[model samples]
Target: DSEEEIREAFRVFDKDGNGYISAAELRHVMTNLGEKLTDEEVDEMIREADIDGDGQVNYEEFVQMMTAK
Candidate 1:
């Protein structure tokens, strides 16, 4: 139930609907939220959540990070 909600939220941030969150997309969203972040900083943030090392945050990766314990 809630898992789908979480996935939907991730999709909202996914922007281009690419099934992953690219560094650019992350940066763009943050910028829209009025928080400026350098490309490097954005890259680092995504890298922290990017488990597969594919340079993007898939739904599974996002869920893993969101529910981290």
Candidate 2:
């Protein structure tokens, strides 16, 4: 159940139901949270979290990022 929490959180950002978080979705979520980030910054975030080097954050990567110490 604890890991489910991370899955739920990932769903929030996977707005298009694509199972991946794109830069635009991330930017939109960040903006809603009062964090304004440029496209480059958002892309950087995806880059850091994207373990597969696919230019997007999937659920696996999301879990890694969320549970990272």
Candidate 3:
């Protein structure tokens, strides 16, 4: 139930519908939310959640990030 909600939330940031959240997509979403982060900051955000270090965030990584305390 909660996972479904999380997936929906992830979809919001995965704007390209490419099954991954790229830096640009994340930045765009944050910008829309009124949080203007720098490129470096955005990269760091992805880095923190990028478990496989593929330079992007997939669904499982996104779930871990969202659920992390």
Candidate 4:
């Protein structure tokens, strides 16, 4: 249940379902989220979780990436 939900969430995060999130694209949403993480902060996060390091998130990795625990 959780895995599927997580996958769906990742898809949603990918917005256009393009499988990549360019820095500019992420910054726009982050702006809406009101968490003005510095570009460095954003880059670090992308590097860690954006599996492909294409600055985007994918389904499987996304589930393990975020720690809401």
Which numbered prediction scores highest in TM-score against the true structure? Answer: 3
Return the TM-score for candidate 2, rounded to 2 decimals: 0.84
- Evaluated at residue 24, the lDDT of candidate 1 is 84
In order, what lDDT does every prediction score? 0.90, 0.90, 0.93, 0.68
**Best model per lDDT:** 3
Residue 54 error for model 1, in Å? 0.8
Clashes of each: 0, 0, 0, 0
* Candidate 3 Cα misplacement greater than 4 A, ranges: none
Lowest-lDDT window of 10 residues in candidate 2? 30-39
Write candidate 2's Cα lDDT for 1-69 as tens digits: 978888889998998989999998998998888887887999999999999998899998999898899
Per-model TM-score, in order, reads: 0.85, 0.84, 0.87, 0.65
Of 3 and 4, the candidate ahead on lDDT is 3
Look at candidate 1 and give me any clashing residue pairs.
none
Candidate 3: worst 10 consecutive residues by lDDT? Answer: 30-39
True-structure RMSD, every candidate: 1.4, 1.4, 1.2, 2.8
Error of 1 at 10 (Å): 0.5
Decide which is better by TM-score, 1 or 3: 3
